Write a protein that binds this ligand. Structure first.
Ligand SMILES: O=S(=O)(O)C[C@H](O)CNC1CCCCC1
Ligand SMILES: [Ca+2]
Ligand SMILES: [Ca+2]
Length: 536
């Protein structure tokens, strides 16, 4: 039986992550100072008689520095006060920042705050073109729109064109901040990634920087980084002992990239257990994907799909040897999850992730049938299958497993495909389809997203990609609306879904395709987050 020729690049990391020995003295020193710095910072936040602009800038700085997870209650109370006092009497810079921070935190501040900055036609007053800080904050704000915010329709184009015009003559690090922003907006970036850039490239170089905050941010980042490196070591050893890199040589060797994904979903220490579970799932489902995509025959894949549905070690014998490997490994991983949640009494929730995995595999098999048949479905039918194959319903569900406060009701809500989840899935699907169209088209994938779209509507490749881009923009608005209070579950269970969408934007930036080819996009991020500490 002829199998395809292996074509994936080797892991580019080797063993450099396999063993990390934390320096307890250094760790405890950092933790001791951070405690002091944390309290100094709390008092900055709780200071009375601050002007609105000063308060917003403080909160914004603490958020960009990556240390706001220490001050969730404090920041919430303050933004809530600002929301309810409803003061509209400020300049563009403060107004746009006020708008972004409140919306990002679920406070539905009216977009009417921007009317004084527009003419009678809703277009921004062109006389604001010389106010760089206003334009920058408007630019960042333009990305948190919902469908109810069409008044802000012009904001992105307006701020973009004038920021571009001004940038070459700005002083540093404002110039670098603007240039970075135009390439990657804050709201749609991976939080650790934006934080690393902000601390090192911007705040560290600000003449006006607060030294207490800067020191706080650097220590905290480097301290959390020690934990992440410990996690990645523990995970790298797990993967090594599985040894798929030799027994399943057709499959991608990408556990580091998978860790980066999981780190993107949450970075905080309290989610350590959750992160480790999540990265194992992503690794394992990546193996299954490649089995369907680049090795298994139709008959093999059918048996594999059936065995998954039945979910029973008895079924291994129905499978070819090489499939027995991943199949047992899958069953065992979930038995590990169950035991790992036993003492917390949360073992019962693992079945939710299993049912989503079954769904992914069913749709993988459908996808294989389509390819073999040369079937090009209508867009609606394509999406009915291809949304699950992003794995994003599955990953979002998995993200909940290690979260100590995730309840059965939280899983029940997720299981109904709520709109914020569907939007995140849609974003992953259409961006991936736009990025990977050309190569899949060369591999004879008659049923790619863009292809289905072209045939269905009778439009060009260009027109199809534009339509897919609109679907992504619509979905972001839905995600943003999905964060507005009151929320159907705790915000803590929405942020993972938002972060999954950010993962997409970052991974396929400039329409590149980055997990399969981590050299392009992900390698600098991995080095910055998991290899190089921030120099103090
Ligand atoms: O759905 S496809 O277009 O064929 C390719 C999807 O982007 C695959 N999503 C990844 C699967 C491997 C683990 C990380 C997620
Ligand atoms: Ca695939
Ligand atoms: Ca793809």
């Amino acid at each position: 039986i002829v199998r395809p020729v292996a074509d994936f690049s080797p892991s580019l990391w080797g063993d450099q992550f396999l063993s990390f020995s934390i320096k307890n003295q250094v760790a405890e020193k950092y933790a001791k100072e951070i405690e002091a710095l944390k309290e100094q910072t709390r008092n900055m936040l709780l200071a009375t008689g601050m002007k609105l602009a000063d308060t917003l800038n403080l909160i914004d700085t603490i958020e960009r520095l990556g240390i706001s997870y220490h001050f969730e209650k404090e920041i919430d109370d303050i933004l809530d006060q600002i929301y309810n006092q409803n003061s509209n009497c400020n300049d563009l810079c403060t107004s746009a920042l006020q708008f972004r921070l409140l919306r990002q935190h679920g406070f539905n501040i009216s977009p009417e705050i921007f009317s004084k900055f527009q003419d009678e036609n809703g277009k921004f007053k062109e006389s604001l073109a010389s106010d760089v800080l206003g334009l920058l904050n408007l630019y960042e704000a333009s990305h948190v729109r919902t469908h109810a915010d069409d008044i802000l329709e012009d904001a992105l184009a307006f701020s973009t064109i004038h920021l571009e015009s001004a940038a070459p003559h700005l002083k540093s690090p404002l110039r670098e901040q603007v240039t970075h922003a135009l390439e990657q907006c804050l709201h749609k970036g991976v939080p650790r990634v934006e934080t690393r850039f902000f601390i090192s490239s911007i705040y560290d170089k600000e003449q006006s920087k607060n030294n207490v905050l800067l020191r706080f941010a650097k220590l905290d980042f480097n301290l959390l980084q020690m934990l992440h490196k410990q996690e990645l070591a523990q995970v790298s050893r797990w993967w090594k002992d599985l040894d798929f890199v030799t027994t399943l040589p057709y499959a991608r060797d990408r556990v580091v990239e998978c860790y980066f994904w999981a780190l993107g979903v949450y970075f905080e220490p309290q989610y350590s257990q959750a992160r480790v579970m999540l990265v194992k799932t992503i690794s394992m489902i990546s193996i299954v994907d490649d089995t369907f995509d680049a090795y298994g025959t139709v008959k093999e894949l059918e048996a594999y799909t059936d065995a998954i549905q039945r979910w029973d070690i008895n079924e291994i014998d129905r499978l070819p040897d090489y499939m027995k490997i991943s199949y047992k490994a899958i069953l065992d991983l979930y038995k590990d999850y169950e035991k790992e949640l036993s003492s917390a009494g949360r073992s019962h929730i693992v079945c939710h992730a299993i049912e989503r995995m079954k769904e992914v595999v069913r749709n993988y098999n459908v996808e294989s049938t389509w390819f073999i048949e040369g079937y090009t479905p209508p867009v609606s039918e394509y999406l009915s299958n291809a949304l699950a194959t992003t794995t994003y319903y599955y990953l979002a569900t998995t993200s909940y497993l290690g979260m100590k406060s995730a309840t059965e009701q939280d899983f029940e809500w997720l299981s109904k495909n709520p709109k914020i989840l569907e939007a995140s899935v849609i974003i992953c699907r259409v961006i991936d389809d736009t990025a990977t169209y050309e190569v899949e088209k060369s591999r004879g994938q008659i049923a790619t997203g863009i292809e289905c779209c072209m045939r269905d509507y009778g439009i060009s490749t260009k027109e199809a990609m534009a339509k897919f881009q609109n679907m992504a923009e619509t979905a972001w608005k839905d995600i943003n609306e999905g964060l507005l209070r009151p929320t159907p579950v705790s915000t803590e269970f929405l942020t993972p879904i938002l972060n999954l969408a950010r993962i997409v934007e970052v991974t396929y930036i400039h329409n590149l395709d980055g997990y399969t080819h981590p050299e392009k996009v992900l390698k600098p991020h991995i080095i910055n987050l998991l290899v190089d500490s921030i120099k103090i």
